[PDB]
Amino acid sequence: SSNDNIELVDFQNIMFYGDAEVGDNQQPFTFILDTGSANLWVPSVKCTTAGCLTKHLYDSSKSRTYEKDGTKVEMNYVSGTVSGFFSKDLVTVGNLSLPYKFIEVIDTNGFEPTYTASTFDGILGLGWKDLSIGSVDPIVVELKNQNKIENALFTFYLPVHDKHTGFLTIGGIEERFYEGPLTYEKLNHDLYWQITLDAHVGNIMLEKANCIVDSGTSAITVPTDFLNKMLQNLDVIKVPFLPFYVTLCNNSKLPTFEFTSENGKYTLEPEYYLQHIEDVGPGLCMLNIIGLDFPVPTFILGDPFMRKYFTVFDYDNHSVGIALAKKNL
Ligand SMILES: CCCN(CCC)C(=O)c1cc(C(=O)N/C(=C\c2ccccc2)[C@H](O)CNC(C)(C)c2cccc(OC)c2)cc(N2CCCCC2)c1
């Protein structure tokens, strides 16, 4: 195809990963491909933490195209912190490469045990420029500016456990990934891939909610008050002292998420947010839903939403395209 494709690998049906390389000798890494952030980083050989020793590491000395920056930098994620300095080298994604600014992480201890538990080496942000630390132009925009792709856009077709692999496609929209109408939602900020949707779940309704499409989050998140009201009398159980909700797997009262705009309507059935714990009798399940409050009431449409819906991230048109993902390729 005319486009750039990076294969997405499924990992336990909740997170997915893809590979990319740094250096002219193309040192390989496994990344969370993250529309929810906007910085690229890789752990350095100069990182000597226990976590780093389990990872693929970046050695600048083995790359002839490496150029020094050294500006100190600290990334603060919700989970925790990685710190290091900026560096510039050739970044290769699929069959395209470009000189790019990224973070060499030298310290990983403030990001444990998350980092060691996970199978990524680093994170490759895919958000907008103002979301990045150090104001780094997004890779896809740069690739567009350099006429290495036709459009400044990328698309996610998520993998499903041994049924099909997935693709991050850079440069154009491929009809093989979706069926039915492809609908566009204008961004309400050039920051996250964030759009405005009315959110209906059951008895509760929130008009014009902020919805962030986030491939770097494996849950759906919901405002805490909304989540409370959502589950009342639904035979869902809050686990004491933990943030988890648990239910019988055959619970017919489990509601379907409904997100609507003037342009389209998207729904998410229990099938996409039920996690099976033990399939004894009626079955014990856990909701893949997290209560979480932002200054503005916000839904985070993470991987479960994207597993049902093929999504298009269009820099040129400042919008998110949504369509029903094909069940198989
Ligand atoms: C199921 C286990 C896998 N996992 C964490 C282990 C790697 C997650 O999917 C996860 C990812 C993020 C996260 O920050 N994702 C991002 C990057 C990332 C960083 C480190 C590891 C993995 C991914 C995104 O960049 C964050 N996106 C934004 C900024 C919009 C955001 C902000 C605030 C909360 C949030 O999570 C929904 C997402 C946050 C969380 N939460 C949300 C509930 C409370 C506990 C922490 C979970």
UniProtKB/Swiss-Prot annotation:
Any GO molecular function: aspartic-type endopeptidase activity
Intrachain disulfide bonds: 47-52, 249-285
Reaction catalysed by this enzyme: Hydrolysis of the bonds linking certain hydrophobic residues in hemoglobin or globin. Also cleaves small molecules substrates such as Ala-Leu-Glu-Arg-Thr-Phe-|-Phe(NO2)-Ser-Phe-Pro-Thr
Keyword ATP-binding: no
Keywords, ordered alphabetically: Aspartyl protease, Disulfide bond, Hydrolase, Membrane, Protease, Signal-anchor, Transmembrane, Transmembrane helix, Vacuole, Zymogen
PTM text: Not N-glycosylated. Proteolytically cleaved into the soluble active mature form in the digestive vacuole by cysteine protease falcipains; the process begins at the early ring stage. Proteolysis requires an acidic environment. In absence of falcipains, autoprocessing may serve as an alternate activation system.
Outcome reported for the amino acid change (mutating residue 120 to E): Reduces catalytic activity towards host hemoglobin
Segments on the Lumenal face: 1-329
Active site: 34, 214
Keyword rRNA-binding: no
EC id: 3.4.23.39
Topology with respect to the bilayer: Single-pass type II membrane protein
Subcellular localization, as worded in the UniProt entry: Membrane; Vacuole lumen; Vacuole membrane
Known partners and oligomeric status: Component of the hemozoin formation complex (HFC) composed of falcipains FP2A and/or FP2B, plasmepsins PMII, PMIII/HAP and PMIV, heme detoxifying protein HDP and falcilysin FLN. The HFC complex is involved in hemoglobin degradation and detoxification of heme in the food vacuole during the asexual blood stage.
Function: During the asexual blood stage, participates in initial cleavage of native host hemoglobin (Hb) resulting in Hb denaturation. May cleave preferentially denatured hemoglobin that has been cleaved by PMI. Digestion of host Hb is an essential step which provides the parasite with amino acids for protein synthesis, and regulates osmolarity.
Protein name listed in UniProt: Plasmepsin II
Organism of origin: Plasmodium falciparum (isolate HB3)
Gene symbol of the encoding locus: PMII
